[PDB]
Design a binder for this molecule. Structure first.
Ligand SMILES: [Mg+2]
Length: 49
RNA sequence: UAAAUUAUGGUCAAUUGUUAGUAUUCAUAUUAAUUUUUUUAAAUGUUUUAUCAUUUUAUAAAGGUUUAUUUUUGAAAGAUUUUUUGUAUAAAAUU
């Protein structure tokens, strides 16, 4: 009975903390995102002849 | 071919753990799997001016390809001084 109780709140905390955890791990990657690639400029740069 | 010189009148050792620094496993370690994790969907407001203008704002990517590199006198710094003057443009060297 308690093993299902441990499994229930782990999925309950996952539904609540899906949105705020996705914002912090996005901002943690943006600090390491020095000189991101612009993909629409490389695809327009390959189009030029 | 110098021929054994004669108080042997001083023996009682070494080890108390304190070091002038590349040290070797042909089978173990590095790689991918038994395991990876987390995101991202473009379409964009730099600003002051004397106003249809003028003053300040000098290294984004792909492509093409390089033996090598750095420092403006000029703009600013910057001053009760002033000449667009204050030695920047080069060499050796190693695919
Ligand atoms: Mg000056």
């Amino acid at each position: 009975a308690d093993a299902v109780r441990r499994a229930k709140i782990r999925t309950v905390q996952h539904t609540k903390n899906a949105l705020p955890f996705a914002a912090k791990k996005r901002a943690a990657q943006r600090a390491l995102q020095v000189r991101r690639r612009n993909v629409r400029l490389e695809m327009s740069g390959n189009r030029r002849r």
